[PDB]
UniProtKB/Swiss-Prot annotation, chains A, B:
Assembly and oligomerization: Homodimer.
Protein name as it appears in the record: Lactoylglutathione lyase
Positions with a binding annotation for substrate: 9, 60, 74
PROSITE patterns: GLYOXALASE_I_1, GLYOXALASE_I_2, VOC
Residues making up the signal peptide according to the UniProt record: none
Induction comment from the UniProt entry of this chain: Repressed by NemR. Induced by reactive electrophilic species (RES) such as quinones, glyoxals and methylglyoxal. Up-regulated by HOCl.
Highest taxon listed in the record's lineage: Bacteria
NCBIfam families on file: glyox_I (TIGR00068), PRK10291.1 (NF007629)
Taxonomic placement: Bacteria, Pseudomonadati, Pseudomonadota, Gammaproteobacteria, Enterobacterales
Enzyme Commission numbers on file: 4.4.1.5
């Protein structure tokens, strides 16, 4: 078995696609609309769903805000250049909650950011 | 770049670990404890962190309950037998919210369950 995706509800679909793709460098894998239940979906990721875990963004028509709660943590993504991503994230709207730098008691560069809906994103600068 | 993991705060570390490992078939990849920040972590997944996406179970010492909220959707997992998984889960600290079965206007078999902390998990099935 395997981990397929993580589903998150967003306040604005396109704004979300835009961020994950244009900012985080992900690609729009697929999108769907459900007239019956009044919601739209978009799957964004770094590779094909068949090979890896991706993100499923859900947008319920007319719903622009949710309650984040205190249980959900975040999603951690591997990053090419944490420093740079922070910059991109910064100048592209999003917030940088933890500037790129080595992790406490370590060397690995990591940062923490927030997507357009306030979701927390951990960026980690990391067989064959 | 890739999806590393999804972090979720749990009310009971071992409880969650047992569920994801014993019930969901995952493996405990690694654990750690931070006294400064007072938390304990357990990484669970169907593969090593370098190969796939995993789940980071976070236990904040002395904290046994969170507010699930309405933003976070779920995590989807592939299963060989959704019906079997449902029964196993329902009988082992979990809860079935959506009996296994094809999706309206489709043949893909899926179910929705809840882990011990209430987290929604989507089960997607991969001539009896």
């Amino acid at each position: 078995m395997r981990l397929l995706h993580t589903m998150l509800r967003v306040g604005d679909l396109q704004r979300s696609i835009d961020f994950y793709t244009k900012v985080l460098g992900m690609k729009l894998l697929r999108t769907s609309e459900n007239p019956e239940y009044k919601y739209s979906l978009a799957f964004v990721g770094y590779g094909p769903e068949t090979e890896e875990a991706v993100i499923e963004l859900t947008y319920n028509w007319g719903v622009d805000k949710y309650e984040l709660g205190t249980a959900y943590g975040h999603i951690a993504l591997s990053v090419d250049n944490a420093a740079e991503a922070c910059e991109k994230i910064r100048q592209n709207g999003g917030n940088v909650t933890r500037e790129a730098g080595p992790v406490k008691g370590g060397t690995t560069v990591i940062a923490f950011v927030e997507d357009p809906d306030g979701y927390k994103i951990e960026l980690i600068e990391e067989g064959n």
